[PDB]
Amino acid sequence: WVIP
Amino acid sequence: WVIP
Amino acid sequence: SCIQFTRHASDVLLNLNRLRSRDILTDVVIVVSREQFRAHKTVLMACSGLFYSIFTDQLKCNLSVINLDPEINPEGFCILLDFMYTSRLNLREGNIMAVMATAMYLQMEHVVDTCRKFIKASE
Amino acid sequence: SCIQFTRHASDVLLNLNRLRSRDILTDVVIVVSREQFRAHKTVLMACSGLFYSIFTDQLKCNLSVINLDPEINPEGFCILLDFMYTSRLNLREGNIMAVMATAMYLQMEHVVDTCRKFIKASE
Ligand SMILES: CSc1ncc(Cl)c(Nc2ccc3c(c2)CC(=O)N3)n1
Ligand SMILES: CSc1ncc(Cl)c(Nc2ccc3c(c2)CC(=O)N3)n1
Ligand SMILES: [Cl-]
Ligand SMILES: [Cl-]
Numbered sequence: 446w447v448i449p
Numbered sequence: 450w451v452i453p
Numbered sequence: 454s455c456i457q458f459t460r461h462a463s464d465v466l467l468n469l470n471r472l473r474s475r476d477i478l479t480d481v482v483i484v485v486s487r488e489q490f491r492a493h494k495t496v497l498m499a500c501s502g503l504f505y506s507i508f509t510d511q512l513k514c515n516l517s518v519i520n521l522d523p524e525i526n527p528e529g530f531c532i533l534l535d536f537m538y539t540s541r542l543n544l545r546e547g548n549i550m551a552v553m554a555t556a557m558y559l560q561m562e563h564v565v566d567t568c569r570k571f572i573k574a575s576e
Numbered sequence: 577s578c579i580q581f582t583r584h585a586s587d588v589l590l591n592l593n594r595l596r597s598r599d600i601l602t603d604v605v606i607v608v609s610r611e612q613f614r615a616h617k618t619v620l621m622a623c624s625g626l627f628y629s630i631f632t633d634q635l636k637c638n639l640s641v642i643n644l645d646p647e648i649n650p651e652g653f654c655i656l657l658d659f660m661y662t663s664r665l666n667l668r669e670g671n672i673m674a675v676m677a678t679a680m681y682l683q684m685e686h687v688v689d690t691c692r693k694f695i696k697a698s699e
């Protein structure tokens with residue numbers, strides 16, 4: 446999971 | 450396009 | 454000896470979401486506490502262990518309406534349906550418990566994992 | 577304020593290809609010079625400008641069989657159908673002209689672009  |  | 458187009462999968466999903474937003478070729482209604490959500494059976498199966506099991510069943514594969522368990526929260530379902538079609542999860546302090554419970558019921562392992570981690574950080 | 581799962585789109589496409597390989601919920605046959613290819617209308621639309629136009633048509637959206645132009649090569653179509661469901665293109669010296677012509681007919685702009693570039697390098 447990432448900060449888009 | 451890339452070499453997978 | 455194949456070549457690969459990096460953005461292809463993302464572009465496919467973006468177009469599937471455009472079809473969903475315009476209600477094109479949607480073939481099922483998911484009913485959650487009277488709230489109704491239109492979707493594509495194939496996308497639901499590709500994202501959820503529960504929908505995969507439902508639509509591979511020889512009788513249920515033909516149903517145009519699926520009713521979820523009454524304990525399922527419509528907002529939690531909406532957030533997860535949005536994630537299915539976009540890869541983006543709107544996870545907030547106020548919805549995390551409903552999102553995790555809905556993801557456990559829908560069998561969406563990666564969502565359950567990130568909810569468990571975000572909950573553990575707050576304790 | 578969403579979080580994003582990097583591998584989600586790729587995982588969705590991988591599952592859609594697993595459904596194709598097991599012939600699960602395929603809803604159309606594409607006929608190419610008597611060769612037949614089963615597929616999902618939504619995936620075809622998501623990858624091709626031609627299928628997008630066909631299945632948004634109020635009459636054609638209901639057809640279970642679509643016949644392509646007789647000039648279309650079945651091998652070129654097979655390679656492109658594989659690309660649609662995997663992001664991988666089996667581009668070879670012996671098939672590049674048939675693949676480019678099929679991609680131009682199917683309106684798959686990124687495939688047409690890589691074929692033009694590979695052809696230009698060989699001249
Ligand atoms: C297992 S083979 C397979 N073949 C095709 C499909 Cl459409 C599919 N979907 C599916 C099954 C289980 C799970 C998910 C999707 C998401 C998750 O967390 N668990 N699986
Ligand atoms: C244009 S809006 C839109 N909405 C939904 C879909 Cl399913 C769609 N597909 C599509 C249209 C045109 C093209 C492609 C896909 C691939 C390509 O090269 N050109 N387009
Ligand atoms: Cl029904
Ligand atoms: Cl998931």
Ligand SMILES: [Cl-]
Binds near residue numbers: 638641
């Ligand atoms: Cl027909």
Ligand SMILES: [Cl-]
Binds near residue numbers: 684686687688
């Ligand atoms: Cl393309």
